[PDB]
Amino acid sequence: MPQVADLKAFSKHIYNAYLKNFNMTKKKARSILTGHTAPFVIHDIETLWQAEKGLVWLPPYKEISVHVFYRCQCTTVETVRELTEFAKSIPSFSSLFLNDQVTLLKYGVHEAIFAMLASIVNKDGLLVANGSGFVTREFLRSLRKPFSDIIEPKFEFAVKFNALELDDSDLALFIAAIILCGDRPGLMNVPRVEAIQDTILRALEFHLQANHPDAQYLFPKLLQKMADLRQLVTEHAQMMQRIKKTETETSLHPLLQEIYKD
Amino acid sequence: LKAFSKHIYNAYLKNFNMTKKKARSILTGKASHTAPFVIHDIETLWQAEKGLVLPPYKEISVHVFYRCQCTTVETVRELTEFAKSIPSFSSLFLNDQVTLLKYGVHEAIFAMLASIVNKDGLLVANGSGFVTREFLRSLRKPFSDIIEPKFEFAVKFNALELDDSDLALFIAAIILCGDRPGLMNVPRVEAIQDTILRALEFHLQANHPDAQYLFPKLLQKMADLRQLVTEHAQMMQRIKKTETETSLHPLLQEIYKDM
Ligand SMILES: CCCCOc1ccc(C[C@H](CC)C(=O)O)cc1CNC(=O)c1ccc(C(F)(F)F)cc1F
Ligand SMILES: CCCCOc1ccc(C[C@H](CC)C(=O)O)cc1CNC(=O)c1ccc(C(F)(F)F)cc1F
Ligand SMILES: CCCCCCCO[C@@H]1O[C@H](CO)[C@@H](O)[C@H](O)[C@H]1O
Ligand SMILES: CCCCCCCO[C@@H]1O[C@H](CO)[C@@H](O)[C@H](O)[C@H]1O
Structure with missing residues (x-):
């Protein structure tokens, strides 16, 4: 099959783009x-x-809850970079005009961030500083209210997500499908992206068959997880808007600022 | 330091197909x-x-207008590869790479046009042809109005007689201009810009010994270039506002928006 041919490879390439760009994999984790x-x-x-x-x-230490909050921002900032590199490591992505790539990463980074978080997390905690630390959920659960409420959802989804048992190759494709999502706000070359998205999803569709043989309704579940990821980032942006309103004191990093503006 | 000027010159030579050289x-x-x-x-x-x-051939003046667009579309494409080709530039988060390109490209397109023009006309289609300024003016006013201001600048710029090596350093100083609106990280840009400008100067003394007052002149041409585009946008908007029949490429839409 002409399709099945250029696809298994297209799959491998992205997987080789994931492995070269993320400082932390579910394998290692x-x-x-x-x-x-x-x-x-x-x-x-x-x-x-x-x-x-x-x-x-790192901002002047004000309090444990705000300090953790900041430590969650840096994470995002460092991840957005690896996600730019990963995006760029896809030849059909790089071809797109610089502005389209920004709109994708802008509206795409957190959907992708909440899926990769699941990798370095278990029902009790998450891995920090290249897995040399383990922040306990119980501790994170005890932080100040405004900031303690953004931490929990991420966990609830991480466990319900990690049950699908997806390895790094599935995630390579999964993340690519999240970044290249035609239905993005103000995208320009929409059809070009929608088109790039289909190749990724079809590749992801073939790949799940080999990689997860006797598995079940896995693919349609991931499209749902993709949808759940859209809603989680939404429920999140909302909590963030309240943090910028009520937490007049705590600051927001430049990159996290320009990501939320409109 | 020249490691910078060689780097930018090789970034400029490799990326843009039509150098002032060939042109x-x-x-x-000549004969070659x-x-x-x-x-x-x-x-x-x-x-x-x-x-x-290329959209449905409507009229004479419009066909040219369209050719002008697809020309700045491949210039913005080489200009993007160029900008990235400056390691210090790429480090920057994609969002700021764009803002610099959103407000810099036209300033940098008009300078390079002069590189391939002269009082009589400009080279088109890889120097394969020669469009005349005469024929260029003749097009309906809602089009001839944008072409000439660039010709006047063109000649009143080639009088400085730069060479590809300088341009490499000129275009870079235009791209990385931390005075662009909405730049997330101004200082990290104002820093790179300074290096390029300092780099430029040192290169102008060596490369244009007798050039009395060169480097301060260029910075002035830089300002004039912001002046040209600023006025260039005004006209473009006015066309987008009048010639409804006339289609504007999506990329030229994103650049202008808000100007
Ligand atoms: C795995 C589920 C945990 C939920 O983690 C989240 C949730 C939301 C966000 C949102 C960030 C900034 C608030 C963003 O909106 O970009 C970041 C993390 C990521 N946080 C961290 O990586 C993190 C990093 C350091 C620390 C520590 F050690 F300082 F306690 C605690 C942390 F949760
Ligand atoms: C060098 C002085 C000429 C002035 O050239 C200009 C001036 C403004 C612009 C503005 C463009 C779109 C209107 C932009 O704003 O990006 C483009 C060109 C570039 N035009 C072309 O490359 C061009 C290309 C083809 C033809 C023609 F006549 F052969 F069809 C004529 C052209 F001026
Ligand atoms: C790789 C990380 C990319 C993060 C990108 C964040 C982009 O924010 C947007 O940048 C655009 C210019 O590029 C502005 O015109 C928009 O107003 C702004 O909201
Ligand atoms: C390399 C050429 C780059 C051209 C870039 C043109 C960018 O236009 C801007 O794109 C932003 C999203 O990226 C929007 O949020 C801004 O409203 C819009 O003005």
Whole structure:
């Protein structure tokens, strides 16, 4: 099959773009949470302040809850870069005019960020600083209200998502499909993207068949997860607008600013 | 430091197909290539279109207007590859790479036009033909109004006699201009811009020894270039506002918007 041909490869390429650009994979991550060092479990002020100073590891320290909030922003900023590189590592993506690539990453980065978060997280916590730390959900659950409410949803979806058992090759394609989404606000060359999206999804469709043989309704579930990811980022942007209103004191990083404006 | 000037010169040479080099030679009636077929009426332009040298052909003046667009579309394409070809530039987050390109391209397109023009006409289609300023003016006012201001600038700029090496450094100083509206990270840009300008200067003393007052002149041409585009946009908007029948490429739409 002429299609099945250029696709298995197109799949591999993206997978080779994922592996070259993300500092953390579910492969590496999953090992840490199961089978070197025992990541310093952060669960309170001491562990936090400890991990901070030098044990494990930025705006003027104001408070633990705001400090964590900031530590969640940096994460996003560093991820958006790897996601630009990953996007660029797709020849049909790079061809697009610079402005179209911005609109994609702008409205796409968080959908992709909430899917990759699931990789470095288990029902009890997430991996920080190249998996050398482990922030406990219980600690994160105890942060100040305004900021403690954005942390939970991310967890609820991460577990319901991680049950599909997707490895790094599925995610390579999954993330590409999230970035190249024609239905993006103010996109220009829409048909070109919609077209690039179909190749990715078809490649993703073939790939799930080989990689997850006797599996079930996996593909349609991921399209749903993609839809759930659209809604999660929405429920998120909303909480962020309230943080910029009520938390008159806490700051927002430049890149997170321009991402939310309109 | 020259590692910067060599880097930008090789970024400029590799990226833009028509350097002042090839172009300037092809106008000095030289021998290493071939004669350029002149275009002055509708018969020559059609011939060019035929073989010797895109929306539904509406009219004379509009067909040219369209050719102007598809020309700045491939210039913006080489200009993007160029800008990225400056490592210090690429580091920047995609969003700012665009803002610099959104307000810089036209300033940089008009400077390079002068590179391929002269009081009589300009080279079109890879120096394969030669459109005349005469034929250019003759087009209906809602089009001839944008073409001439560029010719006046063109000649009143080639009088400085730069060479590809300078331009490489001129176009870079225009692209990276932290005075662009909505730049997320102004300081990181104002820093790169300074390096290029300092780099430029050192290169102008060596490359244009006797050039009395060169470097300060260019910065002035830089300002004039913002002046030209600013006025160029005004007209374009006015056309988009009048010639409803006339289609404007989506990319030229995004650039102008808000200007
Ligand atoms: C895995 C589920 C956890 C939810 O994680 C989230 C949720 C929302 C966001 C939103 C960010 C900024 C608030 C964004 O909107 O871009 C970031 C993280 C990512 N946060 C971190 O990576 C993180 C990083 C450092 C710390 C620590 F150690 F400082 F406590 C705690 C953290 F949750
Ligand atoms: C060098 C001085 C000439 C002035 O050229 C100009 C002036 C303004 C613009 C503005 C363009 C679109 C209107 C833009 O704003 O991006 C483009 C050109 C570029 N035009 C062309 O490249 C061009 C291309 C083809 C033809 C023709 F006659 F052969 F069809 C005529 C042309 F001026
Ligand atoms: C790779 C990360 C990219 C993050 C991009 C964030 C883009 O924000 C948008 O940048 C545009 C210019 O490019 C502006 O015109 C929009 O008003 C602004 O909302
Ligand atoms: C390399 C050529 C780049 C041309 C870029 C033209 C960009 O236009 C701007 O694109 C932004 C999204 O990216 C929008 O948010 C702004 O409203 C719009 O004005």
